[PDB]
Design an enzyme around this catalytic site. Structure first.
Site, short mmCIF file in Angstrom:
data_model
loop_
_atom_site.label_atom_id
_atom_site.label_comp_id
_atom_site.label_asym_id
_atom_site.label_seq_id
_atom_site.Cartn_x
_atom_site.Cartn_y
_atom_site.Cartn_z
N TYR A 150 0.82 -1.21 0.00
CA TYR A 150 0.00 0.00 0.00
C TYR A 150 0.86 1.26 0.00
CZ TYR A 150 -3.78 3.24 1.31
OH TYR A 150 -4.69 4.27 1.33
N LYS A 154 0.93 4.43 -2.71
CA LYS A 154 0.54 5.80 -2.38
C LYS A 154 1.69 6.80 -2.53
CE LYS A 154 -3.77 5.04 -1.86
NZ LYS A 154 -4.66 5.63 -2.88
#
Ligand SMILES: [Mg+2]
Ligand SMILES: [Mg+2]
Ligand SMILES: [Mg+2]
Ligand SMILES: [Mg+2]
Lengths: 239, 246, 239, 246
Positions: A150, A154
């Protein structure tokens, strides 16, 4: 003026759509999962006195995204604001993380933003205007154990934001990101929450509306000289 | 002489990767030289490294392939007895304007540059936890921090690598492992020179030191991060770019 | 090759001087307070087989700094490395902070770095070479309640680092900063220390030598392409 | 109409400060207009503000002077009944090459730009703690983040202001106050225009949007931070610069 919000059936995405509608935007609601939840959001948006419809599409799939943009332009006549909010997590410690846990998150979160930006660009270039707003996260800036996948997406979204901004600036398009901190919608035991609160100067979790308000500002004429930026909305946990 | 400490460098058959390998050798590390295609170039670098007085060998592996990476790490630990330094240098470009970039141009760059770094870190982790020490140094790029038209894929991966650096740093810190990145600016060895002097002139105007950097500038910084001199540095990106980004 | 280190009578400054001496530098030891402590450092440096002497000067005073640089150049023949390490704190909450608490910290920490850079520049310009290394702090990047004055100076030092780097780059001079996290020398109750440790991924405080090693790297030929940078040496507490 | 909420803007007699005051007025804030020298310009801005339908008055104070600032804040709270928004915009330049910059050029810029911001924050703090709410917005500059030859003093203050922003943000957060900064890029009103078109041309090449910004671009961002729309944003620096720094 027309907007498309990805993953808008609930949480931050829904709040973003509702806020854009409040600003006078027609809003297309993209979803992957439940149709009825998306249709409910479309009705909430129509109650604001704007046009709206739901579109099913996996942002990881370039063909589906292309068809999605084409439908929005066909239906609304333009595409002025694109909000890339769709994203998933598949958490695990580094040593335990499965290949599909990596691949799924990278294709949805990072490739998905690329796909949407890419398929939206021809319309915006013809308009010589547009605003693209990508959702990042505080963990993209600070890292977080158990979320290597993740975090990579991002942070990658921030890089993509800057590159697209530099590439599209000459044609009148702004590209920015918003990085939420710990937001109530995204929300655990009160013990874990207590610890998370100690990381936040304002000493409270944020709300969907905090993120939506910032996205709406970036999509407005009031932000026409802002591009390539990441706005952190996190109660001071990262400065 | 087989050193007490050993390093693996990915994409080390030329340019920056090669200079890093040679610099680690000079610092007293046995160095494994990873390559994807050109075996002849990798084996020549191996001989340069052994001339420094340490052990070395070349290993072929596609870093995007989790299974090849696992076999690569096992072979390094087997040959050298440990893995103390991992330098994730391998990377490719597939440049194109945003509206024209092919799906395969996106995928290949993301898999080699971003997934490759993840694979190497993941497969090295068990050995380094076992050692309760190690240094992972990831190669990013100035364009990871500032963006660059025509390189949206490469930029996404180099920014993603900085994120991955911080996340791995936080996860592995408590067990004695540092994880950092180095972000080169415009380095002579990364240029085909096919580009005109006027394009060079324009790039030079972005650099306060008014010169392009050399492979050795990057190698020296990597060697610093890989040393005991840098044991309290983790999660950082060191920009080596002549001031073009501060 | 000759170096000057400000506030070098103890702690990080002393460790920096000792490391530079280990690298083959002649080292001048600037101090404000105790002469005998500085003289002891000078003897430790001489034991490394290099030249050394102590100079008393308040870095906040441009005349004293000018005389200081002149003496170093007179004595060593050049000034190749300048380390601006001198700094003080005068902590207080915003509402309680006295004007002199602000002024003293700004003049010592921020004006002092400016003075030293300014007075060193003519020598370095004539050499067409030099390395300037300024000490900042993790709190310069993240803020800290009760240290508004100190934070302002250490962030200001980062800005000054960048400006000087851009201004002096064409004449062969690099200008960088090092920002320590929580370092043992700088060190409280074990309860407060326990909390501070939870902010640090490496789960330990750093040592003077960690800072000195980084400064020495920046002052070396190995760092000739690095300029305008702030290197954070903080065990991961800020990334 | 006397609004329920009130703002003070420092250095508001022209350019960016004036546009900010006018924009806050449009958002429904009573606005106090601070000035140092030109009273006539400040009083004209006051009349522009009252034309928006809110209350306004002009106050003279040197922001470097703690006692004048204290009197200024007391007068604002007295006239308006509160101080809900504080915009620290006042600032000066005294440009010079590093080796030539006079001690007074350093001192004046540091005292007005950095100490001035500290004084205003310090003196506003008691009222805002009493309110358990407020927004402080500090003006920085792109050069605070990237440096600029010939402006070492100004750069030091604008970087220092970002630090001060983060420190005040952390100290005041728990009592409902946000503290943020805005960093303008190259804005038309900050230029004497005495500079040649070739100098303009060069500056334009640094900006992806390929135009200079306007006072209103800065004003709109300040107004956003001063609104309830931004209640969860604190300690941040918002760069409004057409992409020249990302
Ligand atoms: Mg060859
Ligand atoms: Mg690479
Ligand atoms: Mg006029
Ligand atoms: Mg100003």
């Amino acid at each position: 003026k027309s907007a498309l919000v990805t993953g808008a059936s609930r949480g931050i995405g829904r709040s973003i759509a509702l806020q854009l509608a409040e600003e006078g935007y027609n809003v297309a609601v993209n979803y992957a999962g439940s149709k009825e939840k998306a249709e409910a959001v479309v009705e909430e948006i129509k109650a604001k006195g704007v046009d709206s419809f739901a579109i099913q599409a996996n942002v990881a799939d370039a063909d589906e995204v292309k068809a999605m943009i084409k439908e929005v332009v066909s239906q609304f006549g333009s595409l002025d604001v694109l909000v890339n909010n769709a994203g998933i997590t598949r958490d695990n410690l580094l040593m335990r993380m499965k290949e599909q846990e990596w691949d799924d998150v990278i294709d949805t979160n990072l490739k998905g933003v690329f796909n949407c930006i890419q398929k939206a660009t021809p319309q915006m270039l013809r308009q010589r205007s547009g605003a693209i707003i990508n959702l990042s996260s505080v963990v993209g800036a600070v890292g977080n154990p158990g979320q290597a996948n993740y975090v990579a997406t991002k942070a990658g979204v921030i890089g993509l934001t800057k590159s697209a901004a530099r590439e599209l600036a000459s044609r009148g398009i702004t590209v920015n990101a918003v990085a939420p901190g710990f937001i109530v919608s995204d929300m655990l035991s009160d013990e874990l929450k207590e610890q998370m609160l100690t990381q936040i100067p304002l000493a409270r979790f944020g709300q969907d509306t905090d993120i939506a308000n910032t996205v709406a500002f970036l999509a407005s004429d009031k932000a026409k000289y802002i591009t390539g930026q990441t706005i952190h909305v996190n109660g001071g946990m990262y400065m």
